[PDB]
Amino acid sequence: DDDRTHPIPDLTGYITEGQIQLSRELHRKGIYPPIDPLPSLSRLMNNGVGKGKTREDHKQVSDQLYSAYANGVDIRKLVAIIGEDALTENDRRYLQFADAFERFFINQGQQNRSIEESLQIAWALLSMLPQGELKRISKDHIGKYYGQKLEEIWGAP
Amino acid sequence: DDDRTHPIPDLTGYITEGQIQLSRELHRKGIYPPIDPLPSLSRLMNNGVGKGKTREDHKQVSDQLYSAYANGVDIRKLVAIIGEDALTENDRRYLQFADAFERFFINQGQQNRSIEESLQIAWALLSMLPQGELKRISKDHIGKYYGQKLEEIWG
Amino acid sequence: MAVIADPETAQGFRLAGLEGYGASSAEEAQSLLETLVERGGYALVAVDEALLPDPERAVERLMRGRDLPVLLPIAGLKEAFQGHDVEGYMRELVRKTIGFDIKL
Amino acid sequence: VSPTRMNLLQRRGQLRLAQKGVDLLKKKRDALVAEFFGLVREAMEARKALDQAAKEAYAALLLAQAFDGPEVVAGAALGVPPLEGVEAEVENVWGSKVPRLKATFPDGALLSPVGTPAYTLEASRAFRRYAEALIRVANTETRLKKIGEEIKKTT
Amino acid sequence: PGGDMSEPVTQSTLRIVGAFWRLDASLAFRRHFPAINWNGSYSLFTSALDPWYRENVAEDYPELRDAISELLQREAGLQEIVQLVGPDALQDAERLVIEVGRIIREDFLQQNAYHEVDAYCSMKKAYGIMKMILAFYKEAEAAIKRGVSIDEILQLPVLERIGRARYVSEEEFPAYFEEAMKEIQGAFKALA
Amino acid sequence: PGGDMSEPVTQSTLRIVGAFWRLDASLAFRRHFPAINWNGSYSLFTSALDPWYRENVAEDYPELRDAISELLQREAGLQEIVQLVGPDALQDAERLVIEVGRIIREDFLQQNAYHEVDAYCSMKKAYGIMKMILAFYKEAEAAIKRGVSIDEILQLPVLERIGRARYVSEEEFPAYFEEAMKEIQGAFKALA
Amino acid sequence: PGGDMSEPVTQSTLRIVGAFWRLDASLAFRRHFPAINWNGSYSLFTSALDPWYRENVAEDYPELRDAISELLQREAGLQEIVQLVGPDALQDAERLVIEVGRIIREDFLQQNAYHEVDAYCSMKKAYGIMKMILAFYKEAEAAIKRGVSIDEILQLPVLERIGRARYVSEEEFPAYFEEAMKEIQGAFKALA
């Protein structure tokens, strides 16, 4: 009954390392796969990502994406009350970032994406934010990857 | 404990052909009989009403009264949040409709109202709303019966 | 729009085409103010701060359902030369607006 | 509330809804405070400009009354036409209606523009500048107060 | 028993059926039948029937159905704010979504089983109603960007044309649909 | 299971333990470690350890600890105004409390378990840190009583002497403490 | 157990009894004894005893009883508004009702079982107190319609006569009642 306190979800959480949660709200809007990034968690991420086993900018990019989407989903709720004009500029950038994220990153359809393509899309989505707003990412990766347009994935949404 | 989910009312509702449910809140205000119209139900209503049995406009008037009273009860919860002074006039119309309904239609005492008197009172109560709000009633019945005021009946 | 102040400046305020009344005491001021507001057409009323610092609460009974008369406290002729710091007045505005009494 | 599992789940959902609404209202309050503290500075600037205008207007009035005489100044005052109740056009702040005054008055159309007196017309110009300065303070202060009760309601 | 959906049989039926139509007592109280709880219902046969719908009804019917579902989801999302601050506190572009959702709920989903004409509804009639509602929504969102207040948009006479399309007979609907679409075109262009 | 403290296990444990170090993830989100809650934790061995404390550490230590506790408490009474009005708009008499409590949270409460010298702190080191923080607060309040701006106080060179006290060696600490005491005594009554 | 009125013993009792006097712990906390909750209690013998009341107490006793019941109901209705909006946001036509409800709650319903005199109360004394309270209410409403502020009415000295009335012995009451009745009218006519 979507009840996370039910015994089957509860006893599974004591033995397994995190969970991936599908969202019904994303499913009704036409997004597939409806994986909700906010309540999802992988507890062994830190020992698998990094230099020598994937690209070295993985962890900070993931943290920045999570932190930006968390602000976007709340700014989108505040818009319905206070209107779009009352926001500042960067709040409007976050509001557009959340919509672009849901349109391109999550809604991949039946495509097969390698890790490099996913990281390229992630860095293209972060490019719509101004430089220096990306607090979580170090300068070395920002100078190396920031600035690509989103028109590459726009040819196949 | 006024619990509708108790096994005895549950099975009685599953077996029988309707129920008449009294309300304690209406009884507290002095309304007799304190019949609550929303939880009540009559499954065999469709057989004994209509043209040639009671009158042609009975079925639609009942549904319109149900919808209007439901809207009034809904507004009664929003006024408890923001107050009546912030309401629009349309919502105040429904609120006053509910207040007049509970005091003039349900509250009848020991008198014996005929069916025609009850329908006349019901049409006198629907006239407090704009003519465009009656979506459930055909325009022929509206053109025939709509128009009376409530004060024209009493004395 | 009309103003209420000392009789010395009433002629000067009528010199600009405005409506001007003179007053010399507090109860005279409040009675004159209620006679001012009980009739319409008077969008703005100016009352000197030396005689009635807070006019919208002295007469609040007559406009609580009608925000048409805009009352305003103004500095008098004496204060125009002897000086007055607007910071205290703005702190008082912070007081009867939000009331935390914290501002620098 | 009848104790069932479904009712327990519904109440647990309602708790989350209230907890999210609290944070949303806090964000709205912060957004309102941001404009309030920006408007208070402009109110202060308007007040000090009003004081500056009042100083020179009152000095001119005193000097004109002292040297030209009181009777000639009074006659020049009676030689002016009165201003009407200029329009208080509506204005929207944060979803609420406020009046906005208009500074337009028939300058130059006032009778007796030039003639014998010398110190009275300068005082008239100073006083009409003072009158122009006053309405700006009025227009800013009313919006300041109207933001204030919105802060109070959100809190 | 007592409407408790956590019953062993109800949970046992949940895991072996391809569709699930959950009824609500709240909608039944206000005589809003068939009283289907849109939030807690689902159907797993939607994705497999698309080639039939594209052949027998229209080439763009799934797009209209997805648009209607998206609008209903948006209406459901904003209802958590209405219970917090009231309906009038919302912006105009969101009041439009609320009113369109209410229009859909009172016009398309509701059906009377004892009416002479409303008891049966073919697929093309529902397709016409959905197209009409979506066209009205597009014109209404066009009107908002032109500065038109929403308090007058709902006063247009085309809503009553939309409001009573249920009771039009199947042999009269093909002319009514083309009349109402022309009215929809005319009203909003003459609006501003 | 979900952070609920009404479980039978935690209720049974609470009845018998002498100390209760509650963790919370709100401070872990800020990378503030150790992330214990200092308004939810309690200890019952404080009143019995005082005779050992005033003999082995210093005479004023039981009296000094209450100063740190009250200083941390006073900001919890200022949390109802900071989310409404920005920190810079506060009066200086409250800005002082906010800043000294902040430096307490960021130098005394926090600790780096991975560092070479911060992973272990003897008791006299902590006592010197609390004494030095009280000296800072008392002299800053005395300067504030003379009508000075609090901005010049925040720019004082002794503030970085406050941050660096964590990373001094255990053998090297006393001379650093004496020098910091001299500098903080020189700073505030040199400023008029 | 635990004040739960849904237990089997309470529910089996309510089906048989003709009267139900419900106690409340909230009234007992603030020492408002006898702590009878007047909203949840009921009696089924009120209608049958009216002819006895009409000739053994007074011919208008049920009218006074109903007039006080409506005042209590209106006060309970306004108790949904006042607690979160503010008592001064109401109009005086409702603040008067609030104050009269407070007077009824504290001066009539309350009774001390351990006092020398208050432990026993005849019917005629209660009727006199009821008459005094209703007369005060009507005069206060007339004075409000004269445009007087409510605070000059709450500060009126005649209110203390009603508060001390229930401590007047059964012997003194027939003389106290006439003087209080004259004083109420005199004070409300002498008022502006």
Contact assessment for residue B115 and residue B39, using Cβ atoms and an 8 Å cutoff:
no
Which subunits have 3 or more CB–CB pairs within 8 Å of chain G? B
In the structure encoding, which two tokens stand for residue G119, read together?
Answer: 């432990």
Residue whose pair of structure tokens reads 């007040």 in the numeric block: D47
Which phi and psi (to 5°) does residue F27 adopt? -80, -25
User: A78 and D31 in contact by Cβ < 8 A?
Assistant: yes
Contact assessment for residue A119 and residue A61, using Cβ atoms and an 8 Å cutoff:
yes
Count of domains forming chain C: 1
- Separation between Cα atoms, residue B133 and residue G83, nearest integer Å: 36
DSSP characters over B116-131? HHHHHHHHHHHTTS-G
- Separation between Cα atoms, residue A65 and residue A45, nearest integer Å: 15
* Burial class of residue F162 (count of CB atoms within 10 Å of its CB; 0-12, 13-18, 19+): buried
In the structure encoding, which two tokens stand for residue C101, read together?
Answer: 């009494």
In the structure encoding, which two tokens stand for residue F148, read together?
Answer: 């000075």
Residues of chain D with C-beta less than 8 angstroms from the C-beta of B5 = 2, 4
User: E5 and D6 in contact by Cβ < 8 A?
Assistant: yes
Contact assessment for residue B42 and residue B18, using Cβ atoms and an 8 Å cutoff:
yes
Residues of chain A with C-beta less than 8 angstroms from the C-beta of E94 = 80
Does F85 touch chain D if contact means CB atoms closer than 8 Å?
yes
Residues in a beta bridge with A35: A22
**Which chain C residue's Cα is nearest to D132?**
C16
Residues in a beta bridge with C73: C47
Which phi and psi (to 5°) does residue B44 adopt? -90, 25
Residues of chain F with C-beta less than 8 angstroms from the C-beta of D22 = none
User: E89 and A81 in contact by Cβ < 8 A?
Assistant: yes
- Distance to chain D for B3, nearest Cα, Å: 6
SS3 G191: coil
Contact assessment for residue F13 and residue F23, using Cβ atoms and an 8 Å cutoff:
no
Put simply, the chain F residues between 32 and 71 with a CB less than 8 A from any chain A CB are: none
- Cross-chain CB nearest to B46 (options E29, E114, E163): E114
User: A1 and D31 in contact by Cβ < 8 A?
Assistant: no
- Separation between Cα atoms, residue D17 and residue F6, nearest integer Å: 23
Contact assessment for residue F173 and residue F128, using Cβ atoms and an 8 Å cutoff:
yes
- How far is CA F101 from each of CA C37, F95, F107, rounded to the nearest angstrom? 53, 10, 10
Contact assessment for residue F61 and residue F53, using Cβ atoms and an 8 Å cutoff:
yes
Neighbours of A28 (CB within 10 A): 20
- Separation between Cα atoms, residue D97 and residue G152, nearest integer Å: 36
Neighbours of F185 (CB within 10 A): 13
Residues of chain D with C-beta less than 8 angstroms from the C-beta of F84 = 29-30, 33, 155
Count, residues in chain C = 104
Does F3 touch chain A if contact means CB atoms closer than 8 Å?
no
Which residues make Cβ contacts (< 8 Å) with residue F60, sequence separation at least 6? Answer: F131
Output helix, strand, coil percentages for chain G, rounded to the nearest 5.
60, 5, 40
- Separation between Cα atoms, residue A155 and residue A153, nearest integer Å: 5
In the structure encoding, which two tokens stand for residue F78, read together?
Answer: 């200022």
- Distance to chain D for B32, nearest Cα, Å: 25
DSSP G83: H
- Separation between Cα atoms, residue D108 and residue E119, nearest integer Å: 77
- Separation between Cα atoms, residue F143 and residue F32, nearest integer Å: 31
Comparing C-alpha atoms, which of F30, B80, D11, A118 is closest to residue G85? B80
What is the residue range of C45's domain?
Answer: 1-100
Comparing C-alpha atoms, which of B144, B147, B142, B154 is closest to residue B125? B147
User: G11 and B80 in contact by Cβ < 8 A?
Assistant: no
User: G6 and B1 in contact by Cβ < 8 A?
Assistant: yes
Beta strand residue intervals within chain E, DSSP E: 19-20, 42-43
Does F9 touch chain D if contact means CB atoms closer than 8 Å?
no
DSSP characters over C76-101? -HHHHHH---HHHHHHHHHHHHT---
Residues of chain C with C-beta less than 8 angstroms from the C-beta of D43 = 90, 93
The Cβ-side half-sphere exposure at A21, using a 13 Å CA radius, reads 15
Helix (H) or strand (E) segment spanning residue F62: helix F61-76
Residues of chain F with C-beta less than 8 angstroms from the C-beta of C103 = 89
Tell me the Ramachandran region of residue A35: left when phi exceeds 0, alpha when psi lies from -120 to 50, beta otherwise.
Answer: beta
- Cross-chain CB nearest to D85 (options C13, C42, C98): C42
- Separation between Cα atoms, residue D2 and residue D4, nearest integer Å: 6
Residues of chain B with C-beta less than 8 angstroms from the C-beta of E31 = 63, 66-67, 70
Greatest Cα pair distance, chain C, in angstroms, is 42
User: Gaps after which residues in chain E, C–N over 2.5 Å?
Assistant: none
What b/e string do you get for E84-123 counting C-beta neighbours within 10 Å, with b at 16 or more? bbbbebbbebbbbbbbbbebbebbbbbebeeeeeeeeeee
Technique used by the depositors = cryo-EM
Give the torsion sign (CA, G129, G131, G134, G137): negative
| Helix-helix angle B58-82:B89-104, to 10 degrees | 120
**Which chain D residue's Cα is nearest to A1?**
D9
Comparing C-alpha atoms, which of F163, F156, F165, F164 is closest to residue F184? F156
Which phi and psi (to 5°) does residue F94 adopt? -100, -30
Give the torsion sign (CA, F34, F36, F37, F39): negative
Query: How many pairs of residues across A and D have Cβ atoms under 8 Å apart?
Result: 18
Query: 3-state secondary structure string, chain A?
Result: CCCCCCHHHHHHHCCCCEECCECHHHHHCCCCCCECCCCCEECCHHHCCCECCECCCHHHHHHHHHHHHHHHHHHHHHHHHHCCCCCCHHHHHHHHHHHHHHHHHHCCCCCCCCHHHHHHHHHHHHCCCCCCCCCCCCHHHHHHHCCCCCHHHHCCC
Does C81 touch chain F if contact means CB atoms closer than 8 Å?
no
User: C102 and F92 in contact by Cβ < 8 A?
Assistant: no
- Distance to chain E for B39, nearest Cα, Å: 6
DSSP F121: -
Which phi and psi (to 5°) does residue A137 adopt? -95, 140
Contact assessment for residue F31 and residue A136, using Cβ atoms and an 8 Å cutoff:
no
User: F89 and D29 in contact by Cβ < 8 A?
Assistant: no
Residue whose pair of structure tokens reads 């009041």 in the numeric block: E95
Contact assessment for residue F129 and residue F108, using Cβ atoms and an 8 Å cutoff:
yes
Which long-range contacts link B51-58 to residues 24+ away (Cβ below 8 Å)? B54/B115, B55/B115, B55/B119, B56/B141, B57/B119, B57/B137, B57/B141, B57/B144, B57/B145, B58/B119
Neighbours of E151 (CB within 10 A): 10
Q: Are strands C44-48 and C2-5 parallel, antiparallel or unpaired?
A: parallel
- Separation between Cα atoms, residue D92 and residue D143, nearest integer Å: 10
Contact assessment for residue E73 and residue A25, using Cβ atoms and an 8 Å cutoff:
yes
Q: C-alpha angle D129/D135/D139, rounded to 5°?
A: 150
- Separation between Cα atoms, residue B23 and residue G73, nearest integer Å: 17
Residues in a beta bridge with A19: A41
Comparing C-alpha atoms, which of A25, A46, A44, A49 is closest to residue A36? A25
Contact assessment for residue F192 and residue F144, using Cβ atoms and an 8 Å cutoff:
no
Count, residues in chain B = 155
SS3 G185: helix
Contact assessment for residue A31 and residue A105, using Cβ atoms and an 8 Å cutoff:
no
- Cross-chain CB nearest to C43 (options D77, D85, D110): D85
Residues of chain E with C-beta less than 8 angstroms from the C-beta of D6 = 3-6
Q: Are C and A close enough to touch, i.e. 3+ CB pairs under 8 angstroms?
A: no
User: D137 and C94 in contact by Cβ < 8 A?
Assistant: no
Contact assessment for residue C25 and residue C51, using Cβ atoms and an 8 Å cutoff:
yes
User: F83 and D37 in contact by Cβ < 8 A?
Assistant: no
Instruction: Select from D2, D8, D10 the residue whose CB has the most chain B CBs within 10 Å, as the one to mutate to test that interface.
Output: D2
DSSP characters over E134-169? HHHHHHHHHHHHTT--HHHHTTSTHHHHHHT-TTS-
Q: C-alpha angle C47/C52/C53, rounded to 5°?
A: 90
User: G80 and B80 in contact by Cβ < 8 A?
Assistant: yes
> Using CA atoms in the order D136, D140, D143, D144, what is the torsion angle rounded to 10 degrees?
-160
